[PDB]
Amino acid sequence: GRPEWIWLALGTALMGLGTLYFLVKGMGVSDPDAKKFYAITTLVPAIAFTMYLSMLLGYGLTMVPFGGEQNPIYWARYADWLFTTPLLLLDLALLVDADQGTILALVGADGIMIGTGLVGALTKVYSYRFVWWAISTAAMLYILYVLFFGFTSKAESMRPEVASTFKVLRNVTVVLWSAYPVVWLIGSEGAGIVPLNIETLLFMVLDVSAKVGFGLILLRSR
Amino acid sequence: GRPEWIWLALGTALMGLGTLYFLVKGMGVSDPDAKKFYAITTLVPAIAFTMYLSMLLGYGLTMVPFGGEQNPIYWARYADWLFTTPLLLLDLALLVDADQGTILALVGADGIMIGTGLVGALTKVYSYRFVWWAISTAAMLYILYVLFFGFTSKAESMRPEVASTFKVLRNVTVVLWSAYPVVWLIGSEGAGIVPLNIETLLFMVLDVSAKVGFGLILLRSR
Amino acid sequence: GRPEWIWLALGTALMGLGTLYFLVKGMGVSDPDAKKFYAITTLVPAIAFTMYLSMLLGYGLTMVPFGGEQNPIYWARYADWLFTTPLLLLDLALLVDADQGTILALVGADGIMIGTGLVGALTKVYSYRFVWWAISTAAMLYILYVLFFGFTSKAESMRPEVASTFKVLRNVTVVLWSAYPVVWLIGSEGAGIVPLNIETLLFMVLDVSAKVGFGLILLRSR
Ligand SMILES: COP(=O)(O)OC[C@H](O)COP(=O)(O)OC[C@@H](COCC[C@@H](C)CCCC(C)CCCC(C)CCCC(C)C)OCC[C@@H](C)CCC[C@H](C)CCC[C@@H](C)CCCC(C)C
Ligand SMILES: COP(=O)(O)OC[C@H](O)COP(=O)(O)OC[C@@H](COCC[C@@H](C)CCCC(C)CCCC(C)CCCC(C)C)OCC[C@@H](C)CCC[C@H](C)CCC[C@@H](C)CCCC(C)C
Ligand SMILES: COP(=O)(O)OC[C@H](O)COP(=O)(O)OC[C@@H](COCC[C@@H](C)CCCC(C)CCCC(C)CCCC(C)C)OCC[C@@H](C)CCC[C@H](C)CCC[C@@H](C)CCCC(C)C
Ligand SMILES: COP(=O)(O)OC[C@H](O)COP(=O)(O)OC[C@@H](COCC[C@@H](C)CCCC(C)CCCC(C)CCCC(C)C)OCC[C@@H](C)CCC[C@H](C)CCC[C@@H](C)CCCC(C)C
Ligand SMILES: COP(=O)(O)OC[C@H](O)COP(=O)(O)OC[C@@H](COCC[C@@H](C)CCCC(C)CCCC(C)CCCC(C)C)OCC[C@@H](C)CCC[C@H](C)CCC[C@@H](C)CCCC(C)C
Ligand SMILES: COP(=O)(O)OC[C@H](O)COP(=O)(O)OC[C@@H](COCC[C@@H](C)CCCC(C)CCCC(C)CCCC(C)C)OCC[C@@H](C)CCC[C@H](C)CCC[C@@H](C)CCCC(C)C
Ligand SMILES: COP(=O)(O)OC[C@H](O)COP(=O)(O)OC[C@@H](COCC[C@@H](C)CCCC(C)CCCC(C)CCCC(C)C)OCC[C@@H](C)CCC[C@H](C)CCC[C@@H](C)CCCC(C)C
Ligand SMILES: COP(=O)(O)OC[C@H](O)COP(=O)(O)OC[C@@H](COCC[C@@H](C)CCCC(C)CCCC(C)CCCC(C)C)OCC[C@@H](C)CCC[C@H](C)CCC[C@@H](C)CCCC(C)C
Ligand SMILES: COP(=O)(O)OC[C@H](O)COP(=O)(O)OC[C@@H](COCC[C@@H](C)CCCC(C)CCCC(C)CCCC(C)C)OCC[C@@H](C)CCC[C@H](C)CCC[C@@H](C)CCCC(C)C
Ligand SMILES: *C/C=C(C)/C=C/C=C(C)/C=C/C1=C(C)CCCC1(C)C
Ligand SMILES: *C/C=C(C)/C=C/C=C(C)/C=C/C1=C(C)CCCC1(C)C
Ligand SMILES: *C/C=C(C)/C=C/C=C(C)/C=C/C1=C(C)CCCC1(C)C
Numbered sequence: 001g002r003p004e005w006i007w008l009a010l011g012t013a014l015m016g017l018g019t020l021y022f023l024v025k026g027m028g029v030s031d032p033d034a035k036k037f038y039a040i041t042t043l044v045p046a047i048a049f050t051m052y053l054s055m056l057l058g059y060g061l062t063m064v065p066f067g068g069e070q071n072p073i074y075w076a077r078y079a080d081w082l083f084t085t086p087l088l089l090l091d092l093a094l095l096v097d098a099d100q101g102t103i104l105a106l107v108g109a110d111g112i113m114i115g116t117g118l119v120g121a122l123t124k125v126y127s128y129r130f131v132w133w134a135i136s137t138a139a140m141l142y143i144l145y146v147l148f149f150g151f152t153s154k155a156e157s158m159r160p161e162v163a164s165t166f167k168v169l170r171n172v173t174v175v176l177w178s179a180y181p182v183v184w185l186i187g188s189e190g191a192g193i194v195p196l197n198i199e200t201l202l203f204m205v206l207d208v209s210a211k212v213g214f215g216l217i218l219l220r221s222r
Numbered sequence: 223g224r225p226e227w228i229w230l231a232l233g234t235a236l237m238g239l240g241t242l243y244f245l246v247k248g249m250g251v252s253d254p255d256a257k258k259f260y261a262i263t264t265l266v267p268a269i270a271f272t273m274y275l276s277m278l279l280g281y282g283l284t285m286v287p288f289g290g291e292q293n294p295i296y297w298a299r300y301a302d303w304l305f306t307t308p309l310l311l312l313d314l315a316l317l318v319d320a321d322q323g324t325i326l327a328l329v330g331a332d333g334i335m336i337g338t339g340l341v342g343a344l345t346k347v348y349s350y351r352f353v354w355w356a357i358s359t360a361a362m363l364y365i366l367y368v369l370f371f372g373f374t375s376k377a378e379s380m381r382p383e384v385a386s387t388f389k390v391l392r393n394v395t396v397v398l399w400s401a402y403p404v405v406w407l408i409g410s411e412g413a414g415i416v417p418l419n420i421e422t423l424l425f426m427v428l429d430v431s432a433k434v435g436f437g438l439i440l441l442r443s444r
Numbered sequence: 445g446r447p448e449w450i451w452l453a454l455g456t457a458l459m460g461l462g463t464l465y466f467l468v469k470g471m472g473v474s475d476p477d478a479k480k481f482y483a484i485t486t487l488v489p490a491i492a493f494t495m496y497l498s499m500l501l502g503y504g505l506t507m508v509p510f511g512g513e514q515n516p517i518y519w520a521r522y523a524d525w526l527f528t529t530p531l532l533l534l535d536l537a538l539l540v541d542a543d544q545g546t547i548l549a550l551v552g553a554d555g556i557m558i559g560t561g562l563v564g565a566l567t568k569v570y571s572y573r574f575v576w577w578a579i580s581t582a583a584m585l586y587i588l589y590v591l592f593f594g595f596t597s598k599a600e601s602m603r604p605e606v607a608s609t610f611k612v613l614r615n616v617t618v619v620l621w622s623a624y625p626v627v628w629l630i631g632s633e634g635a636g637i638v639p640l641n642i643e644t645l646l647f648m649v650l651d652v653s654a655k656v657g658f659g660l661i662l663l664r665s666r
Contacts, residue, residue, distance in 0.1 A: 105487070112494060123503060135497075
């Protein structure tokens with residue numbers, strides 16, 4: 001019996017309707033600037049949608065063995081997180097014209113975080129995961145950093161409005177994101193403390209508040 | 223016995239010789255503009271070539287079960303279509319200087335179409351495929367649309383020649399492309415109406431007339 | 445027993461410390477030009493690092509059968525080479541402002557080389573590999589070429605210093621790179637001449653002298 005069905009039966013709707021919501025509202029008035037934007041942000045919840053639906057249907061659920069059991073690992077998790085994250089980081093650096101340097105970097109720093117996440121997310125040695133967990137977090141903290149001391153531009157010739165619009169998402173990333181290693185850590189694959197049911201939910205409120213909500217928190221603003 | 227061998231033994235040659243044909247002819251005279259082009263278009267048939275060869279050799283053929291049989295699904299199909307499609311859409315939007323907005327969008331709209339194609343292209347529930355088929359088509363129709371009402375620029379300061387060169391491919395995409403969901407639909411994995419042999423052929427005439435021919439239909443023109 | 449452990453236990457350190465070395469030294473003084481650079485080059489050894497670590501731990505080792513045995517094929521090899529190569533080619537074409545034409549081309553020409561490498565790197569017919577080996581090399585020789593007669597710009601309005609800095613890496617790529625088909629050829633999957641132990645080492649001196657060293661051979665210079 002799969003009782004994660006409901007928390008996973010609810011991330012399709014939310015993410016899915018979130019997309020069906022940005023096109024409708026999506027258009028460009030005088031500067032095909034928001035145009036680049038209005039796009040990205042639709043992609044983020046849309047891509048995810050196939051994933052929540054992909055977990056939801058029972059297709060993204062393997063049964064890897066940690067010397068003592070045979071547990072579930074929704075591999076289709078890192079997949080959705082694989083294409084959304086570099087898209088958000090783009091909504092970011094874009095807004096805050098961020099030298100391509102921190103850009104190519106920004107992403108790769110991302111990429112390598114999820115990938116390794118994946119590796120340590122399927123390994124059959126109860127003691128080889130966690131190490132991979134280090135390198136991943138380790139890396140996370142690198143974008144996170146560059147995101148602070150980093151994207152702190154030289155707000156001089158720009159919209160004396162961005163600031164907030166920026167730091168309000170810049171504060172929603174540092175908080176919302178930093179939660180993943182923490183759950184993944186003790187979830188269904190970390191310590192075996194919190195089992196899937198609750199984790200999986202901990203995971204969707206973490207997602208939505210990160211996408212559906214995110215994009216709004218921005219496109220409503222200039 | 224594999225009698226799809228011949229229709230699949232012929233897509234290597236066509237696609238393969240099609241490549242060996244664009245480099246030879248490929249060069250740039252006054253504007254490294256066609257340069258960006260002459261490139262893309264070589265990639266399209268070349269990438270494909272490894273794929274027709276990859277199917278052709280018997281390496282891209284799985285045996286997924288639809289509660290009642292055990293049928294073949296050339297997974298190496300969505301692979302070739304995974305990198306060619308975003309390349310063509312580029313030959314397009316390029317030619318028709320198309321705001322990066324419709325661009326990043328164009329592709330992702332593509333991407334998600336093939337990916338999901340893949341998912342519903344390997345699933346073991348005779349009733350979970352088709353749904354995925356919806357989301358894929360559903361999406362197709364989104365680029366298709368933006369391709370019409372969409373790429374209809376403001377032909378003002380440009381080559382009063384593009385138009386045709388454009389709408390002739392723009393008419394070759396809307397027709398040739400829209401055939402895939404229709405075959406995949408009843409092919410060897412849809413309904414089990416048309417078996418592989420014929421499908422596979424339906425599939426290669428669909429491909430070539432889409433690449434070998436395509437690129438020509440363009441680079442011959444200015 | 446795995447005696448490749450040491451040669452693979454040493455590529456983590458080298459590549460790993462090589463990264464920990466470019467950030468530290470990595471910064472931008474007057475032109476966020478080196479900025480684009482200082483980035484790429486950190487990625488190259490870093491990405492690799494997870495891979496040497498991924499081989500090193502025993503996670504990237506399959507057991508494919510060549511009609512007569514059951515041999516090892518560190519599939520996690522083409523993975524690291526999948527993202528580093530298009531990054532180096534970028535350190536290159538960048539430095540030598542290289543029309544996007546040769547650029548998009550440069551990479552795809554790369555991409556298809558490793559991919560096919562992979563295909564012929566896992567196939568279970570002792571006689572179908574080598575063919576794939578052809579198409580791969582075949583392709584290699586295409587970037588290699590464009591790298592010579594090709595990137596030979598029109599050194600006119602530029603740093604009368606690049607030249608060397610260029611041809612010294614341009615000479616380190618043509619030599620160091622061209623060795624892979626040659627080892628892969630007779631290694632543990634080609635002819636079965638040189639077994640893993642030595643190959644694997646032949647392979648890491650080939651790597652480092654290609655990355656750790658590479659990047660240095662450049663960023664030290666202007
Ligand atoms: C079978 O054996 P075994 O495997 O061993 O056991 C395992 C056992 O199945 C475990 O669970 P449980 O034991 O609890 O039983 C099962 C279940 C009983 O129900 C069955 C009905 C299910 C199928 C309906 C689910 C609805 C859903 C996930 C859609 C949510 C999307 C909407 C509409 C909101 C978006 C718009 C909004 C912003 C206005 O319970 C769990 C079911 C309940 C929690 C469902 C009701 C609440 C949810 C939150 C709203 C959906 C209601 C809709 C009808 C519309 C109204 C909303 C709005 C428009 C006003
Ligand atoms: C009954 O049980 P039992 O049988 O006993 O148990 C037995 C058990 O159930 C079954 O077997 P096994 O244990 O062997 O399972 C092994 C299984 C796991 O590997 C999955 C592949 C994952 C690990 C790789 C994806 C991430 C990645 C490539 C890391 C680096 C990515 C970066 C940094 C890019 C960003 C950089 C930026 C600058 C742009 O498959 C092994 C599969 C192999 C046999 C096949 C070949 C490998 C793949 C297909 C090639 C590489 C492709 C990548 C590009 C992936 C795409 C995403 C990527 C870009 C992030
Ligand atoms: C510089 O001055 P400034 O005033 O900024 O001037 C400029 C001018 O005012 C421009 O306005 P701005 O935009 O800055 O306004 C303000 C801004 C605030 O950000 C808030 C971010 C949201 C995500 C968080 C709200 C909670 C909060 C701030 C309280 C802190 C305490 C916590 C975290 C709880 C601890 C409890 C613990 C025990 C668990 O935005 C406001 C906009 C939002 C209303 C947007 C909507 C988001 C929703 C959540 C998602 C939508 C989709 C849902 C249906 C999916 C999920 C539902 C479900 C599963 C939960
Ligand atoms: C074995 O048991 P089982 O598995 O149970 O059965 C299963 C049973 O094998 C199923 O099939 P079938 O029963 O029919 O028998 C098998 C077969 C008999 O043949 C064997 C010869 C095969 C190997 C030759 C195939 C040729 C090919 C696919 C290349 C096409 C590329 C070219 C040259 C064109 C591009 C240039 C052009 C634009 C000028 O038949 C099927 C074979 C015939 C259909 C092949 C002949 C026609 C094709 C279209 C042209 C190739 C001819 C070349 C020699 C050059 C001439 C062209 C030009 C340059 C002037
Ligand atoms: C005897 O028979 P039996 O044993 O009983 O039957 C048992 C049977 O035969 C064997 O087992 P199973 O049923 O479990 O098979 C499950 C099998 C299928 O999954 C294949 C992976 C496919 C589904 C994923 C590719 C597409 C994708 C990621 C969708 C979204 C892509 C978008 C939207 C990008 C464009 C966006 C734009 C903005 C740039 O593998 C399951 C494999 C897992 C165990 C391993 C981990 C997953 C992978 C490797 C990580 C994700 C990588 C992706 C980036 C893929 C690359 C392409 C992508 C970019 C399009
Ligand atoms: C605005 O005015 P305009 O006049 O445009 O002025 C500007 C100036 O004239 C510039 O010229 P342009 O370019 O526009 O000229 C015209 C243009 C027309 O497009 C035609 C597209 C091709 C793909 C389709 C031809 C068929 C047709 C138009 C008839 C309609 C009826 C159908 C579809 C059949 C229904 C039957 C049903 C029962 C099945 O191009 C002409 C160029 C072509 C000759 C290019 C070559 C393509 C070939 C097919 C592929 C090459 C490789 C092959 C060896 C592989 C496959 C072979 C095999 C498997 C089939
Ligand atoms: C078990 O059964 P079975 O599977 O059948 O057999 C199979 C049988 O295990 C096969 O191998 P072998 O039979 O040979 O026995 C095994 C082994 C015995 O050792 C065990 C100790 C191992 C664990 C230590 C390895 C060290 C390593 C790979 C790190 C290198 C990185 C550094 C420090 C250099 C970077 C900085 C530099 C530029 C300053 O041997 C093989 C072990 C020896 C080759 C190791 C010593 C030399 C290496 C090159 C340097 C590392 C030394 C460090 C302590 C620091 C000093 C360097 C510097 C800072 C001054
Ligand atoms: C006990 O032993 P036994 O069981 O008897 O033996 C049985 C034995 O052990 C187990 O089974 P099998 O033999 O069937 O193994 C088959 C296995 C191998 O395939 C691995 C996938 C590799 C081959 C594909 C990666 C490379 C690629 C896509 C080539 C082209 C790339 C280019 C040119 C891009 C650059 C272009 C540029 C312009 C940007 O998996 C088969 C897996 C399938 C079932 C699942 C679906 C396929 C995948 C997931 C979708 C495609 C994703 C790609 C985008 C890959 C990512 C990297 C790429 C970008 C380079
Ligand atoms: C145009 O005039 P120019 O004079 O250029 O004026 C401009 C001004 O002079 C600017 O200076 P430039 O930069 O051009 O200076 C010169 C340049 C030379 O390039 C040399 C490249 C290195 C990679 C190769 C050195 C060997 C050589 C040239 C001899 C040839 C014979 C061979 C190949 C052996 C045959 C034997 C066979 C039997 C095996 O650079 C010098 C910089 C280097 C010192 C950089 C450091 C690289 C090291 C190797 C890697 C670092 C990390 C290691 C810890 C990892 C691996 C260790 C281990 C496993 C091996
Ligand atoms: C829309 C989805 C988002 C923003 C997902 C973000 C995910 C992370 C920041 C994940 C981090 C992880 C680690 C640092 C280590 C273990 C594995 C992960 C993927 C949970
Ligand atoms: C060179 C190859 C090309 C242009 C391939 C195009 C493929 C499609 C438009 C495929 C569409 C599909 C669906 C809409 C649903 C089912 C799966 C596909 C991939 C056949
Ligand atoms: C940092 C890693 C680098 C620069 C790796 C380069 C690898 C190659 C040039 C590999 C070439 C191959 C072939 C031409 C055929 C067989 C397979 C390969 C991948 C070894």
